[PDB]
Every structure is written in structure tokens, then in C-alpha cells.
């Protein structure tokens, strides 16, 4: 049993690596054959996947905030705004609104 | 040896998919025991990286699209205001111009 023991754990662990755990533990990471090597390798990939992980979620918050600034200036010029053209600022405004929601969806969809 | 070829050839397997590079191919995929097995395990995680990828790389354009309208809106609403309120108008085509500019370096730096 201990010949297929090591074959079945490896096989578990690439199902939770293609399911994107990287909260799973990998096997017999503390061997010191060929056996002990292999598992290292998979433990080296389940490391590099859980750091792209991290580095995209800060991306997306680098790129929200930079996208606030424009909303933001755009909604305080158009409240200066005469009255012979409210139906122009109002406008303007509905599409500040669907500006916002495509990045809220964004951010829903990776979240 | 033979014992070690294989063990060998799974390592680089392994350094290929963690530095990202989906076109390296995976060897003794074609094997019936247990090794052929352990292979094709490999090759299904690194088929998953590839499809991700590419989901991830059509997400993109729809948001880029969505994005798109609103920023179109604004403009010809503008355009059509009266002169004393230029000033108003002008500032925000160059908010816009800012939302475009931001959207276009995500994608650059993905592409």
C-alpha cells in the first residue's frame, strides 16, 4: 500500500491546485528522495499561484482609485452648471452613474 | 538511468508552469502506469492555467466596451452647451479624456 500511498496524496493535491485552494497542504513535503523532491516542486507552484493571487487584487484597487478622480470631477463642474441646461447636466450624470457600475461588476465578477 | 530520466523531465515540466509558460509541452503523457497517470495530471492543470487566460483576456473587452458608452455620452452631450458655460464643458471632456487614459494602461500592461 505504501507503493500507491504517495501517488494517490500527489493526485489529491494537483485537484485542489486546478481548483484554485491554495489553502490545501501538500504531502510528504518533508522526504528526502525523489519522492520528497516531486512534492517540493508542487509546493513551489502552489506558492507562485497564491502570490499572482495577491498581486492582481492590488492592481484592481490601484486602478479604482485612479478611475475616482475623473468621476468626481466631472459630477462637481456640472452641480456649477446654469439652469437653461439641466437636461444637459442631467444627462452627464446618468452616465457617471453607468461608468461606476461597469467597475463595481468588474470587481463582483473577480470577487 | 531510466529511473531518474522521468523525474528529471518532471521537474523542468514543473518550472515551465510556474514562470507561466503555457506552451511548453508535458513528456510521457502517453504512459499507462502510474507515471503516465501522474503526467497527465500535470497537463490538466496547466490546460486550466491556459483557459483562464484566455477568459480572463475576453473579460477585458467587455469591459472596455461597457465603459466605452458612457464616455461617448458625455461627449455630445457637451458639445452642444451653450458659451457661457464653456468653460464647465471643457473640463470635462479632459476628465474624460483621464478615464480613457487610465483603462488603456490596465490593458497595457496586461498586453
Redesign the interface.
Given at each position: 500500500s505504501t507503493i500507491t500511498r504517495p501517488?494517490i496524496e500527489?493526485?489529491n493535491t494537483?485537484d485542489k491546485?486546478?481548483e484554485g485552494n491554495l489553502e490545501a497542504e501538500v504531502p510528504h513535503q518533508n522526504r528526502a528522495d525523489?519522492i520528497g523532491?516531486?512534492a517540493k516542486?508542487?509546493e513551489?507552484?502552489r506558492r507562485?499561484l497564491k502570490q499572482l493571487a495577491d498581486d492582481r487584487t492590488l492592481?484592481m484597487a490601484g486602478?479604482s482609485h485612479?478611475?475616482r478622480?475623473?468621476?468626481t470631477?466631472?459630477r462637481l463642474?456640472?452641480e456649477?452648471?446654469?439652469e437653461?441646461?439641466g437636461y444637459?447636466a442631467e444627462?452627464?450624470n446618468?452616465?457617471?452613474e453607468?461608468?461606476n457600475a461597469?467597475?463595481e461588476?468588474?470587481i463582483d465578477?473577480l470577487r
Open positions: 501517488i500527489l493526485s494537483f491546485i486546478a525523489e523532491i516531486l516542486s508542487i513551489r507552484l507562485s492592481l486602478v485612479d478611475l478622480t475623473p468621476l470631477r466631472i463642474a456640472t456649477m452648471m446654469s437653461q441646461d444637459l444627462s452627464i446618468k452616465d457617471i453607468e461608468c461597469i467597475i461588476q468588474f465578477y
